[PDB]
Amino acid sequence: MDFTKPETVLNLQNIRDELVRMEDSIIFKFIERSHFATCPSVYEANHPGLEIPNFKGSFLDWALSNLEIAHSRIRRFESPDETPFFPDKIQKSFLPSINYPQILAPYAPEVNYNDKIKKVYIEKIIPLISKRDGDDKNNFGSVATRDIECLQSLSRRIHFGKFVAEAKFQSDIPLYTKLIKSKDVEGIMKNITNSAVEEKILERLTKKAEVYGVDPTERRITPEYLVKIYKEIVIPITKEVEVEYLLRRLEE
Amino acid sequence: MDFTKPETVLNLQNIRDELVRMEDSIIFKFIERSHFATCPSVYEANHPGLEIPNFKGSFLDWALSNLEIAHSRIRRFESPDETPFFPDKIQKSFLPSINYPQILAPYAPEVNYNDKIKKVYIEKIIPLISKRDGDDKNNFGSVATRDIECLQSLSRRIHFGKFVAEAKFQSDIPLYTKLIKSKDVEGIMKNITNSAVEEKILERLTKKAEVYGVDPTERRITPEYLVKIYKEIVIPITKEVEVEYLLRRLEE
Numbered sequence A, B: 001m002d003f004t005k006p007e008t009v010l011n012l013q014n015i016r017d018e019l020v021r022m023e024d025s026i027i028f029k030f031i032e033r034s035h036f037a038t039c040p041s042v043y044e045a046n047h048p049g050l051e052i053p054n055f056k057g058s059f060l061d062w063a064l065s066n067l068e069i070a071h072s073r074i075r076r077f078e079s080p081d082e083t084p085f086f087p088d089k090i091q092k093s094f095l096p097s098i099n100y101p102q103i104l105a106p107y108a109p110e111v112n113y114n115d116k117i118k119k120v121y122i123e124k125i126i127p128l129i130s131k132r133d134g135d136d137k138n139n140f141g142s143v144a145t146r147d148i149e150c151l152q153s154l155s156r157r158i159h160f161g162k163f164v165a166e167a168k169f170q171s172d173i174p175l176y177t178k179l180i181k182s183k184d185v186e187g188i189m190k191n192i193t194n195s196a197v198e199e200k201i202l203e204r205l206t207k208k209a210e211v212y213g214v215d216p217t218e219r220r221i222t223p224e225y226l227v228k229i230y231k232e233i234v235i236p237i238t239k240e241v242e243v244e245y246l247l248r249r250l251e252e
């Protein structure tokens, strides 16, 4: 799977292989975040103890958005597989453009669930993966930066749906063209769901969590929780992006 | 703790013991609700697909209010520990009155947070305890009825604050009389907060959630979430009722 070989990019298998390598990345990232308390204050927008000059949002917010700006400048978002958590704040690259062939539809950047991911991450995931409950009054930076690692991997993974979505469309235009004109969610949802795969995925996760989540010489990550996270969130939103991308596919 | 032994009712310990038995009730209720999707449509007031003849409100609304009426008739609300979610719609009992001695101040019925509880329950709790996200197009009744079980236990528990509040007042009139005339929230808040207890509570919850939330032969309820719910909502609003009841205590 290379971005300058549209064929390898739109291959459904190659895509799944890539999602797989990501499983480990996410696990690792979770494991790292697991070393710190939940740190409520990091996520509170405009916390009194952490007022950020000219900024409405959370500590995490500041850190993340800033990083997105810096990165935007060095071509981060002109890569189709990277969708910004703060699209309203990203500048243009001061580096000559990498001219990636179009592999997706022109509106792809507009398909963007980060808003959700971030909320669910903070509300549902954190409680599952952190040591204690409470503020680690002098690790907010440590926590935030890690949070961002998680968030950027989740977003990459999830937004990969677009590639899958496109891949599936391509492979039976009529079936999908029919479904899309109809705005037949349930029908589309039915066709993209492939439970067999979803299941085998949760199986790997459980093993990985077992072997990675424990010092081989315990439980920095709970296998059940890792499954829960994926099963309830990761995989549901990935599909949720496929339908979305699909509805607008015939668009224009 | 018997309602016809004012002394056992106003005992701070007996009261805490009763709040404890409730922990399990709530857990059980959560666990039951956990079997179904979030079912957005149940909570939407006047949903097009579920228009209820002569009724402005949600499906849940209809079901709950109706039940409150029926119950009111058979003496439900003349019991001090039961505070109505729909006080504006409850009738009088067609059964001879149980004549409970006054154990609380006369305005107690007026101290009523259901409005909040219901909103927070729907917005914050549901997302934490349900299987999937989405409408289970043919379980709205199943979901609603369960929702009501949760709501009625939460409300009972939370409004128990009044009893605690009264209990504490009684045990140092001057301190509180002083505080109340002053409208000294923070002072009152400080005196009723007893972190030690709050903490031991969250400890039990975590264990219970572990043992109850899993088939002993998993995770119908997440221990962390159960704590979150209590820590963030249950316990905060219970206090919020104690101050409220307290401010109006000297009233008249």
Ligand SMILES: O=C(O)[C@@H]1C[C@]2(C(=O)O)C=C[C@@H](O)[C@@H](C2)O1
Residues within 6 Å of the ligand: A016, A019, A164, A192, A193, A194, A195, A197, A198, A201, A234, A235, A236, A238, A239, A242
């Ligand atoms: O075809 C696929 O492989 C993709 C990925 C997906 C996931 O989230 O892992 C797995 C199974 C499918 O039901 C969906 C979602 O599309």
Ligand SMILES: O=C(O)[C@@H]1C[C@]2(C(=O)O)C=C[C@@H](O)[C@@H](C2)O1
Residues within 6 Å of the ligand: B016, B019, B164, B192, B193, B194, B195, B197, B198, B201, B234, B235, B236, B238, B239, B242
């Ligand atoms: O004295 C008490 O026992 C009550 C109950 C309470 C709770 O919500 O559990 C626990 C501790 C106190 O800080 C408050 C709230 O008053």
Ligand SMILES: N[C@@H](Cc1c[nH]c2ccccc12)C(=O)O
Residues within 6 Å of the ligand: A071, A072, A074, A075, A076, A077, A079, A082, A098
């Ligand atoms: N992988 C692409 C885009 C990219 C991904 N992550 C980044 C972070 C910073 C800058 C660019 C990127 C590239 O570097 O060409």
Ligand SMILES: N[C@@H](Cc1c[nH]c2ccccc12)C(=O)O
Residues within 6 Å of the ligand: B071, B072, B074, B075, B076, B077, B079, B082, B098
């Ligand atoms: N426990 C009281 C009041 C009560 C509680 N829940 C009820 C439901 C319906 C009718 C009455 C009640 C009684 O039954 O005497």
